[model samples]
Target: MTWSGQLPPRNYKNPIYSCKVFLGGVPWDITEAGLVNTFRVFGSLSVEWPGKDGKHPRCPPKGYVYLVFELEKSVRSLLQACSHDPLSPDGLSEYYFKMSSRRMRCKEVQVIPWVLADSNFVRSPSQRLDPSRTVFVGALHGMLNAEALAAILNDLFGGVVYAGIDTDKHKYPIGSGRVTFNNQRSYLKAVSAAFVEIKTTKFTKKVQIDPY
Candidate 1:
């Protein structure tokens, strides 16, 4: 007899330690299965597909894949060695893989608290996150996309969940956008740390938003 689609769950009584890391700026061409296959190159990973409800079968994967290394020691090593750049570079366009700073500093054994509640949850004035209120991550290069942008924020700070993005071609000037952690604390951290490094030369070219 042959089983199809779903396979029996492999029980590891003492499940090997794992960490949830988001794979951003995936070019939209990459499928879930393809993503699983790619990470397999790093270590022994028990890939879990996102459920129809958008949560993991056991625990929601924090919007990223749950990677279980064969040995705990391999976790850090895999992270340090991992890169998004594909082995063969396209002659026409070069693609590179970048691991976020969040992944670098992430502790394998620590718990990552994620907000999975409904979007309707009321946000108080104190909860509001405006572009000005949050740390200013301005001066982005023209080529950056939502995924790559999210990954950069995720690496630098851990609480970002792709909030809102604007990619309307007709919307000229700013090609992409995002809404990060809805609260002030996380937003502040993201702005201060990430915005500081943006090169002024690149930022000076953006379309200005009229304050009036």
Candidate 2:
């Protein structure tokens, strides 16, 4: 279906290999079937409304939904087709899915690998280091290991000096990581971009990069 919103630049290409996406500001009236049907052309999808409660008589009108796709290409194709330039006052674009002749407005949508259980989970001073040539990436999907992370950084920044994830005592990834670059220019490029992606077996994971 055709959608409207702030579109990424024509030359823009997402390097991440994630197949999951977040649909925010979904209309109350939209049904799961309608949502699924609207995006089915992209690929096999499993749509879920995480906020849905069985106790409620009707599904909540607001909040968000998660879509898991079978292939990374499907997610990329959907973003290319639906995303557009901002038409709203806040300088944020809304995505619209055409159902029949009617346009259903989705306030926000983006491909993200996984959700953060706690919004404020990244509080460690270690997470925030010198910003000159280091970057902190948070909310990593559990599937992204060091090899995938380093490859992503190398592709995005060119010649990554170091890339690693912060794990617990048990050595399990804690949904965060760090990337150090070989030069100031590469680090600055990552800071300005503020994001990167890596491929997992099931989907592509997007990482939030910040100056550390």
Candidate 3:
């Protein structure tokens, strides 16, 4: 991954149908039941999560969430509710999603259909993801956390089970990360696409996605 046109998974057949939503900046203490209850009003939903094992469940969510909506209409209603009106003075929305008083980002994701697999990272060092299925991404902004990185990549490329930012010893972001795909199609597309657009808050940039 080293070029352009990877901003959106749009209009590319066998690529995406816009039924997924990516939730970022989630509260650290939010529970599965709490989140499920919040989104249930719109439609039937399934939350996508990366591999969890050995104390991972005890930890908070990794800062983002993936939601699979059975109907695209649910995706539509969500965006209408949370999306900021660009034409407005500050482009802020009346319904910015916040859980436990922490501001969060809600986005629509058009993704290629792909499978899910059991994969992980945590207390057990041996449980790290397979490098062969992982894509190396670079040039992330400091504000772009692992959650945003993974959510955006999954939104654009699909099957992204996990993603993380390389950081300084102080835990500050250093503008790079690993994005792992759960299936081959998404992996190949991510590899072949070369450049990926990494986004956060009011910013967006084209970052390289390459083999690790």
Best by lDDT: 2
- Candidate 3 lDDT at 177 equals 68
lDDT of 2 by residue, 1-212 (tens): 11121122112223454334556555554566566787787778766654556665247446556666664666656666864544353432334443343354434443333212211222222544344666788876554544445445656646455565654422234577666655687676777777655443334556677776
Candidate 2 lDDT: 0.52
How much is 105 displaced in model 3, in angstroms? 38
Residue 130 alpha-carbon offset, candidate 1, angstroms: 11
lDDT of 3 by residue, 1-212 (tens): 32332332211112122234445555453455566677678888666555545455544456665666564555555555653433254532222454343355443322122111101122223355665777777765533433344445656656545565554322223466666556687777777777765343454566667765
Q: List model 1 lDDT by residue over 56-120, tens digit each.
A: 34433444543333435444444445433322433212222433335333222211111111011
**Candidate 1 ranges with C-alpha deviation above 4 Å:** 1-137, 163-169, 175-178, 182-184, 194-212
Ranking by TM-score: 2, 3, 1
Window of ten residues with lowest summed lDDT in model 2: 1-10
User: Judged by TM-score relative to the true structure, which candidate is superior, 1 or 3?
Assistant: 3
What overall lDDT, based on C-alpha atoms, would model 1 receive against the true structure? 0.35
After best superposition, candidate 2 residue 124: deviation in angstroms?
27
Q: State every prediction's TM-score relative to the real structure.
A: 0.28, 0.42, 0.36
Q: Report per-prediction Cα RMSD to one decimal.
A: 19.1, 13.4, 13.7
Best TM-score goes to which candidate?
2
